[PDB]
Structures are given as C-alpha cells and as structure tokens.
Write a protein that binds this DNA or RNA. Structure first.
Ligand SMILES: [Mn+2]
Length: 192
DNA sequence: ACTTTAT
DNA sequence: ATAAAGTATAGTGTG
C-alpha cells in the first residue's frame, strides 16, 4: 500500500470550514453518523476554541515581529495522513491509533511539538484518515513558505514513509516524481 | 521570481 | 521604500 500524505494551506477564512468538518458540528452522504463517536482527537486541545482563535493566539503571543499577522497568512498546513483501505483492514484499533500517533510524532519531532494544533482522526468516512494542522511557526516567524517549500515536500515524500516502516508499518513511498494531479475529494468521487 | 502585505 | 511572506511545491485516494 501507498502512504498518503499531503498538505492543504489554511487561511483564516477556511479554518471555520475545517473546524466544522473535523469536529462534526453539522450531513455528507459518505459520513456514517453511527460511526462518529468512533473518531478521536490526538492533541490536548480545547474543543470549544476555534482553530482560527487557537493558532492566532499562539502565534501572536510567540512571534518576534511587532507587525500584525497578514490577513492572507497561511495559519496552518493541514496534512491528510492516510493510505488505502487494504492497509487499514489489516490493523486493529490499537495499531490504527498508533499509526496516526506515529505520523503526528514525525511532524512534532521535525517541525516542533507545539506546532501541532489539531490531529483529528476520522473513522466515520470511507477509510481511516487524520486531518493534522501543523503551524508553520519557527524562529519567532510564521511562514509556510519557509517551512514547506519544494525541497521540503520532496523530503517528506521520501522520509515520512521510511519513518513509518521504521516504526512497524508496511507501506511504501509514492511514485518518485509522480505525474498525478491532486483531485479534490468531490472530483475524485466523480472519477470513480 | 513575481506580487501583496503591514508597516 | 522595505522585507517578509503571499503565490506552488509532493504525494494518492472515495480525506
Ligand atoms: Mn475527514
């Protein structure tokens, strides 16, 4: 099976939408409401605090510069962490939890533990997956541009699958220099 | 490497 | 007027 890891840039304006989905505050034909109690959150975060509020307070309190966070700032990079169904069918509940906790560890150790703003695991859709918001805050500065550039995303695609298999998980990296285009969830569904 | 942003 | 961070990136699946 392939390791699926990819980020989506979150500005202020789409964090409300991310929170609404991640915390199940609504539904979509592919969400089994009976299975939603099965989801879990891997961080210590407060469920009654928006992501937009949480991240802004954290950055505003920690930043070296006196300038306000720009309105088009990438407040976080939401990584999807997943694989195919076959990969998951092989794992019990405990192993599935370890898998996501392990993925979270990679990003904690590489980009700062205090930057993992949420790590929300969904078992009530088609396949287990985690929406994990990594705040690109380093050296007192917030910059997705500085944290996740071309070389860095290339590095993750090689190193993260390796780190997972080093920790017990049988999955391989995606095709090197893969020519695929990201489809949206809704666009992937039309494709099937 | 070219714009937008908050000074 | 200045400089940091915006824009993409790399990967596969019914997020
Ligand atoms: Mn989901």
């Amino acid at each position: 099976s392939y390791m699926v890891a990819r980020m989506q840039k979150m500005k202020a304006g789409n964090l409300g939408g991310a929170f609404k989905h991640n915390e199940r505050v609504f539904s979509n034909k592919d969400i089994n409401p009976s299975r939603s109690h099965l989801n879990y959150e891997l961080t210590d975060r407060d469920r009654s605090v928006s992501y937009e509020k949480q991240i802004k307070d954290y950055v505003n309190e920690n930043k070296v510069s006196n300038r306000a966070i720009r309105k088009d700032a990438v407040l976080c990079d939401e990584w999807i962490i997943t694989s195919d169904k076959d990969f998951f069918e092989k794992l019990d509940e405990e192993q599935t939890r370890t898998f996501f906790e392990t993925a979270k560890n990679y990003f904690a150790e590489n980009y700062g533990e205090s930057n993992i703003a949420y790590a929300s695991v969904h078992l009530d859709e088609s396949t287990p997956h985690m929406h994990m918001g990594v705040v690109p805050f380093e050296n007192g500065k917030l910059s997705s541009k500085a944290m996740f550039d071309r070389e860095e995303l290339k590095h993750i695609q090689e190193d993260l699958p390796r780190y997972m298999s080093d920790h017990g998980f049988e999955l391989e990296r995606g095709k090197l220099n893969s020519e695929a285009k990201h489809k949206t969830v809704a666009e992937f569904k039309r494709a099937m």
